[PDB]
Design a protein around this ligand. Structure first.
Ligand SMILES: N[C@@H](Cc1c[nH]c2ccccc12)C(=O)O
Ligand SMILES: N[C@@H](Cc1c[nH]c2ccccc12)C(=O)O
Ligand SMILES: [Cl-]
Ligand SMILES: [Mg+2]
Ligand SMILES: [Mg+2]
Ligand SMILES: [Mg+2]
Lengths: 659, 652
């Protein structure tokens, strides 16, 4: 998009150029330095996204009162904020010049991620004694002096210490936090009215699907079938019956978006899907409700197929037999809060209509209250086969040859890691809901989904977070790579878990994906914002042990949520590195489409938030047959037989559901 | 100006990670260009450095061979193959796997621990490097992990600095930026020939002064009277008798530069001094001679007076009785290498001419050789302080009141002491250098005054490569009468909150000065609150380093940092105004800078403390100390008396 522009107001003290260095290192951009006595009217304040007020009347006041921009006051600037809003700046208990204090804080805003206490140098005889009602203290010295404050509403922050002093710690981190706060402010800067109703019941999610949604017709169920503090909390359900609901599909080959309106009309448009999605999410922007503990305030629920790579970094090598994208615009949704044991009902009216949103709220609420009442596959059994009626696109011998081709390409330096996949097809008479009811019992996961669309049903037991994007512009990806089968005993199982956490080969497979996802996020994230808070964590699900790494970033200003997904699509954890050359190798060897498998499934909120899973451990139901993808990383250290066995093991939850 | 980096994208999935690391390390994002860009249409001239990303790749090959820019090759970034090196199969393919990397700590590896952890993404490695290439780093399985071309500004790393599993990636990208800055500063016609002769003798320095320099003439002796490894090593002596020699003075009041040539005639020019000096050093540019182990390749030797502040960030509040600048343009000089026990003789001719530089080198070498055979290596009774004790105590009171109103955090308050003396320059300096051996001793014997410096303090040491170091001193103790007293006082100096605060505020101030002229990320403090012991006092000393931005002259760096933070205090502009009001007169040479500006672009400048100025049968010496909120009036006065001991003993 673009880089953030910081204004550094020089108040003519001997600190401005140290702050210059710290902003430059923290943000990857030098700030524009302007003297405090410059002409405000002249100054292109419009061009700037964040102001740092240096220590030492003038434009400092204007910046704080008039600019409407995020401001960080450093020392005399901090006192400026306290004063300008009717505070008392009187003498501290002890004058402190070039002297060190332990600063304790709440770890909020500019103090995010800093240890309490941390060491900071002070250069003042004056402190914010009596804080106004509009300001709140965030930090205090061992001396009892206010060291940090903020305005309760406005994006204004003060520190009564020098972050940039040689005797201070985490100076750069404080400046990076302010940049992040500035980005979050500008993202926060509508054709609908969002109605919300909390119901103090939590019925069984499957009872809600069966009781509240129609058996026949287009429906979604975002299923936290595994609920675990910090990993998953919410489930979402809806249908296309609402008067503002739409069903949207995309065909890469035609390049056309087909939208079936609530009217009945299907509109057709020749353009790329991510571009289409970006336009609609901008046009339909609705702010998050502060009484909602989640950020899905309605929007699009559905899937992005692998073949959409043709409009990201990939080639249109193969045609999916399924829509390359399929989404319900959910005008009406049921949210289950599994932590608090309540439901939230969300409904849209057009800004100037009573489209029966409030009527749906009260009726669904009455329906919900009436509904409120109260495995482990080890090797070698897990690696039996794909099922009795099942045909893999590539039989064992075919797949061993593609693995061999992968090892040659790696040896010739064309790829570092190839996520080679197979596609298995099995005739079934099973309908979506009973089959899904068996799958979710077999493999409880944080990112379960049942999509029941006209052209297909998607039965996902994915545990994998592709992208979680806040309305504030915060981004998290948790690529999974490195797999170990479960043990047929609990001894063998704790062993295989330890083996996965410690083996060089699996760590290398995962690390190369972390670097790849870091690269994708760095193309759309602010410089210095991309980091890896967690490397090589082991997660255990009913069918497999998984190596998982966590990568976070913060979107650049001008970068849409849709743009972020496009840049990272398809997921590095399903392609390998380098992505463009590897996707070409996958085109040649797999000799057909992945379809929904290896794509992304989840929601884009009208708030600009998103939560997308990677489509793995998924059954696509269409035209009397079940289709499921399986695969794994091929690296120089890969054994052909072991890699094939891993693909069979990963099929086991799906094979068991269909059995 | 900031440095511009071109990042060549070789269509791999590492480019935006390298982008992030360059951005954070250098404070500027690189311009990213794909490897299939048009070379003719690409404005390579507008860029200062190339990073070749991992991955036919045209722009990459032409970056390394065709362009004369600094290049860092990352993995695929070619340099081995292009210069007739071998690319062979490594003992094991390494993709996303960590190696322990051991290195020489040179160039891109500067300041990295050995070993450090690095992630590799390659099956192929450089095996047989040609003479022109040099290995810098090796893996724990014996593969070359880093290389450089011996002449061209080309570095290769056979690992990913920017990988999550690598350490010190940002430090590697910053090191490359520093090397790029160094290279361009060394490209920047010469009106002189530089002639160098090494003589493998080392006579007594004081005998070289007596023997090789004239008694009555205008001379310099930069005297490492203390010689300690990595602290001081060289002395420099010269006179104005050469044919290309000039004597040079400035007056702030007139704004006039006075140049006395070999002719004996004096030219006068109205020009800010730092502007004139910057102009001359640009026009008189001569590259460093690599056979010289020191950076002074001849140039200007002298002092910048405190009152020059009028043309930096200060006001012209008082007129010095002495020139505000005074330099000998030394066309001939003797360098003593106290470490290797040899002498180096430097002499300028005009380009294509013979002004007798070889004759002076040959003659002076003989004189040095024969000289080395004969000589191998309170304030005082008639002293008057500008401020008596009672007056100085009340000036300290005024300082405390300014600090109470938050106008200053630290004021370097000083006194000026004057005494009649019969002593002449050389004998009195002979006494001083025995009393207080220091790394930055000097005897300047100019027409208007003699300067007898026993200064231990480094103001600015600037490489030809644009590397800057400042070692501000703040925090003083008297010497103890025993070894055990000295240990107590050294411990006490390092530990006291007051002294640590005095020092830290100058470190912050000098960081601020260097950041105005230095590359973003380059300014750091490798040592904080180190105690150094000299004959007269224990000193608390901190070290600050940076790299000059491209298009910043050495003179512009001195201007930005002058006067020294260690002699003013923070904030400098307001604090210097308080000093103007309370000191009631000029500092002159005292509290200014004394040293050399080399034709190479290098410089080495001391702070003028522990110095006697001789003029009109009168001795003048400044003494001062930090006034802070914690300052006691009596103690701060006594510190000024303690700091006078060396000068008072020498005059006595
Ligand atoms: N687990 C998510 C909700 C969810 C369930 N299944 C999903 C599939 C895709 C995206 C999100 C989901 C949460 O707790 O908020
Ligand atoms: N100590 C310096 C030379 C030197 C001695 N006295 C000086 C005074 C000013 C500048 C330099 C010097 C060196 O070893 O290189
Ligand atoms: Cl990082
Ligand atoms: Mg620190
Ligand atoms: Mg594998
Ligand atoms: Mg690291």
């Amino acid at each position: 998009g673009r880089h953030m522009r910081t204004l550094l107001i020089d108040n003519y003290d001997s600190f401005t150029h140290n702050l210059f260095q710290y902003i430059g290192e923290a943000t990857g951009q030098p700030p524009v330095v302007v003297p405090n006595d410059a002409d405000w009217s002249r100054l292109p304040v419009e061009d700037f996204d964040a102001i740092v007020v240096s220590p030492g009347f003038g434009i400092s006041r204007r910046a704080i009162t008039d600019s409407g921009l995020p401001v960080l006051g450093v020392c005399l600037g901090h006192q400026g904020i306290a004063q300008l809003f009717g505070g008392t700046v009187g003498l501290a208990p002890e004058p402190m010049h070039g002297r060190v204090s332990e600063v304790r804080h709440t770890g909020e805003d500019v103090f995010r991620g800093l240890p309490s206490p941390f060491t900071a140098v002070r250069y003042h005889s004056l402190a914010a004694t009596d804080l106004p009602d509009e300001l709140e203290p965030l930090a205090w010295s061992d001396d009892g002096v206010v060291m940090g404050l903020r305005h309760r509403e406005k994006p204004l922050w003060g520190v009564q210490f020098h972050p940039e002093s040689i005797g201070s710690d985490f100076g750069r981190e404080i400046m990076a936090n302010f940049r992040d706060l500035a980005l979050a402010h500008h993202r926060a800067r509508s054709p609908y009215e969002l109605h919300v109703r909390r119901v103090d019941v939590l019925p069984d999610a499957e009872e809600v699907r069966r009781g509240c949604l129609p058996g026949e017709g287009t429906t979604f169920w975002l299923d936290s079938s595994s609920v675990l503090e910090g990993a998953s909390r919410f489930s979402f359900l809806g249908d296309d019956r609402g008067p503002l609901a739409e069903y949207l599909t995309y065909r890469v080959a035609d390049g056309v978006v087909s939208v079936r309106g609530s009217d009945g009309t299907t509109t057709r448009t020749r353009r790329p899907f991510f571009n289409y999605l970006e336009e609609q999410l901008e046009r339909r922007r609705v702010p998050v409700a502060p009484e909602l503990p989640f950020e899905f305030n309605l929007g699009y629920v559905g899937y992005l197929g692998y073949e959409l790579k043709a409009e990201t970094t990939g080639d249109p090598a193969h045609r999916s037999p399924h829509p390359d994208a399929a989404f319900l615009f959910a005008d009406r949704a049921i949210a289950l809060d599994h932590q608090e044991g309540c439901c939230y009902l969300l409904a849209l009216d057009r800004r100037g209509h009573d489209d029966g949103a409030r009527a749906w709220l009260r009726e669904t609420a009455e329906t919900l209250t009436g509904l409120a009442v109260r495995m482990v596959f080890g090797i070698p059994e897990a690696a039996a086969g794909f099922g009795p009626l099942a045909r893999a696109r590539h039989d064992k011998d075919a797949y061993l040859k593609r693995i061999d081709e992968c090892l040659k390409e790696i040896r010739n330096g064309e790829s570092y890691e190839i996520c080679l996949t197979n596609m298995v097809t099995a005739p079934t008479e099973a309908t979506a809901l009973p089959l899904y009811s068996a799958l979710r019992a077999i493999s409880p996961v944080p990112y379960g989904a049942l999509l029941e669309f006209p052209e297909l049903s998607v039965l996902s037991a994915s545990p994998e977070r592709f992208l979680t994007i806040g309305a504030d512009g915060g981004v998290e990806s948790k690529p999974i790579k490195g797999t170990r089968p479960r043990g047929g005993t609990a001894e063998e199982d704790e062993r295989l878990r330890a083996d996965l956490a410690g083996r060089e080969k699996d760590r290398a497979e995962n690390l190369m994906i972390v670097d790849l996802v870091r690269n994708d996020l760095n193309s759309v994230c602010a410089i210095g914002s991309v980091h890896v808070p967690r490397l090589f964590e082991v997660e255990t699900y009913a069918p497999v042990h998984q190596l998982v790494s966590t990568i976070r970033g913060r979107l650049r200003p001008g970068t849409s949520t849709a743009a972020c997904v496009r840049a990272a699509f398809p997921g590095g954890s399903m392609t390998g590195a380098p992505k463009k050359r590897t996707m070409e190798i996958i085109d040649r060897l797999e000799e057909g489409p992945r379809g929904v498998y290896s794509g992304a499934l989840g929601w884009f909120a009208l708030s600009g938030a998103a939560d997308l899973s990677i489509v793995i451990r998924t059954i696509v139901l269409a035209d009397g047959q079940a289709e499921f993808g399986v695969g794994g990383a091929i690296v120089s250290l890969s054994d052909q037989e072991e890699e094939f066995t891993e693909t069979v093991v990963k099929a086991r939850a799906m094979v068991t559901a269909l059995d």
